[PDB]
Design a protein around this ligand. Structure first.
Ligand SMILES: O=C(CO)N[C@@H]1O[C@H](CO)[C@@H](O)[C@H](O)[C@H]1O
Length: 810
C-alpha cells in the first residue's frame, strides 16, 4: 500500500496466510465458522511472533558467543502499549500482513484494535522505558529490560457522571501471545528474617522465600534482526508455603500479591510495604540473573566491564545495597572492593524534583523487611559521610543534608541520596532539569562529586511515534528524503529545504486533516460525541496533576466561552479542546480537575450560542494506544507545566514529531524543543524558572491577580457561585480555595500571558499556509528528540559501549 510499510511479496503473503490458518487451527483450536475477530487477532499475533523467534534465539546466542558488556535497565514500569503493529513495523511485515489478511477477507486495522495495551506503567517514566528498549535494540546493544509482570497494570478509567471510576486492567485475561514463561529460571527472593553475625561474616537467616518466575518478551530492533529481551518477574509461592491445609494453600496469595498490581501513582511517593516488596523483588531476582549470566561467560574486578545497571528512578535503588550484600556476604569480597564494583556498575536517572515524589522509606519498614540491607545502608552512609567530612571539614549542616538517613519523628532513608552515593553517574532527563539538580536538590552532591552529574535529554522512538501511529506523515516525508530518517531522525532537517515547497505544504496539511477526520470518526464510533474536524484540535494529554496545570487550560477554556457569550456574533477560530489523562485514585484534587473539565464541557457543549465554535472533550482512558490516535490528530500541543516542575516531558516530543505546534512554558524539554525549532516557531509563554524563584522569595499572592484581572475574577466567581455545577453550587470550592490560597504551581501568575499567547495561536491558525510552514519547521527540527540519540548518549557517556546500526544475519 505505502512504501515505509515494506514489501508485500507474493511468497511472503502466501506463507503468512498459510501460517495464519495453521495457528487458527492448531493453536487456537478453531474452525473459521466459529472464529471471532479476537481469534483472528491471535492467529495474526502468533504468525508474526513466529518471525521473531529465529532472530530472538540467534540474537541471544550471539551475545553468549561475543560476550559484550551487558546493559540492564531496571524499571518498575514498562509502558509498552500494543505489540503487534510495532513488531510488524520493525520486521518489515506490515504490508505483507495487510495483504495476507485482506486476502483472507480481514481488516488488519480492526484486528489491531483487539490487542490490549500492556499498561505496565503510569505515564512518562514507564513509556520512556518502553522507548528506550526499542532504541537499544535498534542500536544493537546487548540490553535487557527488567521489571515486574503485573497481573494488573494501570487501571482502566471510566467516566461516570463526570467522575473518574477505576476498573482493574485485566490485560492478561485472554492471554499474552508475546511473552514466554520461563518457569525453569525461577529464582528465590528473601524477605524479613534477621541478621546473624558469625566468625566469618554476617548471615541473613530465617527469611520468608518468595519465588520470582521470569516471563520474557521479545524487543525487536528496527529492521536490524536484533531481538532483545524484556524479562518481567512474576511472584510465586514456594510449595512448602505455610505447609489448616485449605487455608495454607489459600494464603499462597499473600506471596503472589507482590506482582499483582501496579501502584497507580505518577509523581507521588506512597510509603507502602507492598511497594517496597515489589521494589526489592525486582531487584533481588534481577541481580541473581545478572550475576548468573556474568559467571556463565570469581574475579569480580571485571564485573563493571561486563555489566551496566541503569536505575530508572530510585524505585530499584535497592540494587545498590543488594549488590553489596551479594558481593560481601555471599562472594566474600572485602567492602571497599565490592563498593568499587557497585559504584562502577550502577548509574541513576532522576525523573523529578517534586519533593512528594521522592522516595523516603521509614527505617522501621526496612528494619523488618530487609534487616541486612538496612545494615549495609548505614555502613554506606557512614563511609560516605566520612568522605564529606574530609572534603568539607567542620561543615556539620552539610553532613545532615547529605546523610542517606534523614532524622525526624520517623527516621527515613533517602533513596535518591543512596543512588547518588552508589552510582558512578547521575543524570537528569532534560538540560534544565539536570541543571536544577546541580543547583538545588543535589547541590551538595554535585559539589562533592561534580563528575557524576550528567544530562541525557529524553527522547521518543520514531518507530512507534511516527511510522506506526502516523503512516501518512511517514510516507510523505519518505517520498522526499527516503527511509533512512526512521533510524536516524536528524535527517528530518532535510525537510527545511521544503518549507517553501507548495506540494509538501499541501501534503503536510492533508495528512493532518486526514488524521483529524479519522480521529473525529473514532470519537463518534466509540464514544458517540460530535466534533467539527475543521476546528483547531487543542489537546492536552498526560497524567492529571496540579503541576501539569490542566487547570490553567480550564481557565483559558472558560475565558474563550465567556468571550463568546460576551460577543456572540464575533468571529473566533473554532476549537476542539481535548484534555485527557488519569488521576491517581487517592489524589482528590486531580479527581476534582477531571470533574471540572467534564462540567465545563457540560455547559459549553450544550450552549446553543456557542455552536460548533467551542467544544470541550475529556478523553477517557488515556493510554498508549489512545496516544497513538490523538497525537497525529492534534494541531496544538499543551505543555503548560509551571516552569521547573516537568523534568522533561515526552508527550511534547510526540506532538512535535506529528505536526502539532506547541504552546508551552520554558520547562523541561520544551526549552530544547524551542531551541531546536527556533523560538519564532514555538508558542512560548509564562514565567521562566527564575521568575518563579523571584515570586517565591517575594511570596505568591494569588489574590493580587484576582484583583487586577477582571476576566480571571469572573471565572472564579462563576466557579464559586455554581455556574458549572447548578445542583451542587459549592462542588468546586476546593479548587477555588486551592487557587486562591494554596496554589504551589502559580496558575494565576501565568494566566494573562497564556491567554495572550493563545490569541497568537488562533491568529496563526487563521492562516493555514503559515501554520503549516511552522509545522514543517517543527517536524524538521524534531530529530534531537529521538530516543536513538538519547540511548547513544547513555551508551557512550555512561555505559561505555558503542551503538551499532549493523544488521545481524536474518
Ligand atoms: O514519572 C515520573 C516520576 O518521577 N517522572 C516523569 O519521568 C518522565 C521520563 O523521564 C519525564 O518526562 C517527566 O517530566 C517526569 O515527570
Amino acid at each position: 500500500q505505502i512504501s515505509v510499510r515494506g514489501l508485500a511479496g507474493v511468497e511472503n503473503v502466501t506463507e503468512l496466510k498459510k501460517n495464519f490458518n495453521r495457528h487458527l487451527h492448531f493453536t487456537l483450536v478453531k474452525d473459521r465458522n466459529v472464529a471471532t475477530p479476537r481469534d483472528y487477532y491471535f492467529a495474526l499475533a502468533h504468525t508474526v511472533r513466529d518471525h521473531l523467534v529465529g532472530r530472538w534465539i540467534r540474537t541471544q546466542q550471539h551475545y553468549y558467543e561475543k560476550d559484550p558488556k551487558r546493559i540492564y535497565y531496571l524499571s518498575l514500569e514498562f509502558y509498552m502499549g500494543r505489540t503487534l503493529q510495532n513488531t510488524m513495523v520493525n520486521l518489515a511485515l506490515e504490508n505483507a500482513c495487510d495483504e495476507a489478511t485482506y486476502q483472507l477477507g480481514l481488516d488488519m486495522e480492526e484486528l489491531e484494535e483487539i490487542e490490549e495495551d500492556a499498561g505496565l506503567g503510569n505515564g512518562g517514566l514507564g513509556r520512556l522505558a518502553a522507548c528506550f528498549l526499542d532504541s537499544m535494540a535498534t542500536l544493537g546493544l546487548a540490553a535487557y529490560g527488567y521489571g515486574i509482570r503485573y497481573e494488573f497494570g494501570i487501571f482502566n478509567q471510566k467516566i461516570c457522571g463526570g467522575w473518574q471510576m477505576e476498573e482493574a486492567d485485566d490485560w492478561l485475561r485472554y492471554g499474552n501471545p508475546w511473552e514466554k514463561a520461563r518457569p525453569e529460571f525461577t529464582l528465590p527472593v528473601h524477605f524479613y528474617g534477621r541478621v546473624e553475625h558469625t566468625s566469618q561474616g554476617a548471615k541473613w537467616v530465617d527469611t520468608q522465600v518468595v519465588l520470582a518466575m521470569p516471563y520474557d518478551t521479545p524487543v525487536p530492533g528496527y529492521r536490524n534482526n536484533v531481538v532483545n529481551t524484556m524479562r518481567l518477574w512474576s511472584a510465586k509461592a514456594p510449595n512448602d508455603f505455610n505447609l489448616g491445609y485449605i487455608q495454607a494453600v489459600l494464603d499462597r496469595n499473600l506471596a503472589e500479591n507482590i506482582s499483582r498490581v501496579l501502584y497507580p501513582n505518577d509523581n507521588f511517593f506512597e510509603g507502602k510495604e507492598l511497594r517496597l516488596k515489589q521494589e526489592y523483588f525486582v531487584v533481588a531476582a534481577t541481580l541473581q540473573d545478572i550475576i548468573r549470566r556474568f559467571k556463565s561467560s570469581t574475579n569480580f574486578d571485571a564485573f563493571p566491564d561486563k555489566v551496566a545497571i541503569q536505575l530508572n528512578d530510585t524505585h530499584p535503588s535497592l540494587a545498590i545495597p543488594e549488590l553489596m550484600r551479594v558481593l560481601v556476604d555471599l562472594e566474600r569480597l572485602d567492602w571497599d572492593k565490592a563498593w568499587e564494583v557497585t559504584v562502577k556498575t550502577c548509574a541513576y536517572t532522576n525523573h523529578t524534583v517534586l519533593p512528594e515524589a521522592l522516595e523516603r522509606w521509614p527505617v522501621h519498614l526496612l528494619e523488618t523487611l530487609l534487616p541486612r540491607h538496612l545494615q549495609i545502608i548505614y555502613e554506606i552512609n557512614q563511609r560516605f559521610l566520612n568522605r564529606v567530612a574530609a572534603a568539607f571539614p567542620g561543615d556539620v549542616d552539610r553532613l545532615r543534608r547529605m546523610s542517606l538517613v534523614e532524622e525526624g519523628a520517623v527516621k527515613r532513608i533517602n533513596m535518591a541520596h543512596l543512588c547518588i552515593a552508589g552510582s558512578h553517574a547521575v543524570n537528569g532527563v532534560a538540560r534544565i532539569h539536570s541543571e536544577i539538580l546541580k543547583k538545588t536538590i543535589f547541590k551538595d552532591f554535585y559539589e562533592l562529586e561534580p563528575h557524576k552529574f550528567q544530562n541525557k535529554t529524553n527522547g521518543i522512538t520514531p518507530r512507534r511515534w511516527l511510522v506506526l501511529c502516523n503512516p501518512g506523515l511517514a510516507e510523505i516525508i519518505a517520498e522526499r528524503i527516503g527511509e533512512e530518517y526512521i533510524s536516524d531522525l536528524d535527517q528530518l532537517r532535510k525537510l527545511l529545504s521544503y518549507v517553501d515547497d507548495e506540494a509538501f505544504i499541501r501534503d503536510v496539511a492533508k495528512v493532518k486533516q486526514e488524521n483529524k477526520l479519522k480521529f473525529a470518526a473514532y470519537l463518534e464510533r466509540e464514544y458517540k460525541v460530535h466534533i467539527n474536524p475543521n476546528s483547531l484540535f487543542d489537546v492536552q494529554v498526560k497524567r492529571i496533576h496540579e503541576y501539569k496545570r490542566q487547570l490553567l487550560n480550564c481557565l483559558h477554556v472558560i475565558t474563550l466561552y465567556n468571550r463568546i457569550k460576551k460577543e456572540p456574533n464575533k468571529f473566533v477560530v473554532p476549537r476542539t479542546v481535548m484534555i485527557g489523562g488519569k488521576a491517581a485514585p487517592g489524589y482528590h484534587m486531580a479527581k476534582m480537575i477531571i470533574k471540572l473539565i467534564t462540567a465545563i464541557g457540560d455547559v459549553v457543549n450544550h450552549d446553543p450560542v456557542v455552536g460548533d465554535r467551542l467544544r470541550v472533550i475529556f478523553l477517557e482512558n488515556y493510554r498508549v494506544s489512545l496516544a497513538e490516535k490523538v497525537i497525529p490528530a492534534a494541531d496544538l500541543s499543551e505543555q503548560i507545566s509551571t516552569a521547573g516542575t516537568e523534568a522533561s516531558g515526552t508527550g511534547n516530543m510526540k506532538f512535535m514529531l506529528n505536526g502539532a505546534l506547541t504552546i508551552g512554558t520554558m520547562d523541561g524539554a520544551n526549552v530544547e524543543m524551542a531551541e531546536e525549532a527556533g523560538e519564532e516557531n514555538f508558542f512560548i509563554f509564562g514565567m521562566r524558572v527564575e521568575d518563579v524563584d523571584r515570586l517565591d522569595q517575594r511570596g505568591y499572592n494569588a489574590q493580587e491577580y484576582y484583583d487586577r484581572i477582571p476576566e480571571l475574577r469572573q471565572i472564579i466567581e462563576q466557579l464559586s457561585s455554581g455556574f458549572f455545577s447548578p445542583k451542587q453550587p459549592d462542588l468546586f470550592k476546593d479548587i477555588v480555595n486551592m487557587l486562591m490560597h494554596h496554589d504551589r504551581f502559580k496558575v494565576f501568575a501565568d494566566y494573562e500571558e497564556y491567554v495572550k499567547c493563545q490569541e497568537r495561536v488562533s491568529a496563526l491558525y487563521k492562516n493555514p499556509r503559515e501554520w503549516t510552514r511552522m509545522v514543517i519547521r517543527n517536524i524538521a527540527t524534531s530529530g534531537k528528540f529521538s530516543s536513538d540519540r538519547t540511548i547513544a548518549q547513555y551508551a557512550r557517556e555512561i555505559w561505555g559501549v558503542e551503538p551499532s546500526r549493523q544488521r545481524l544475519p536474518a
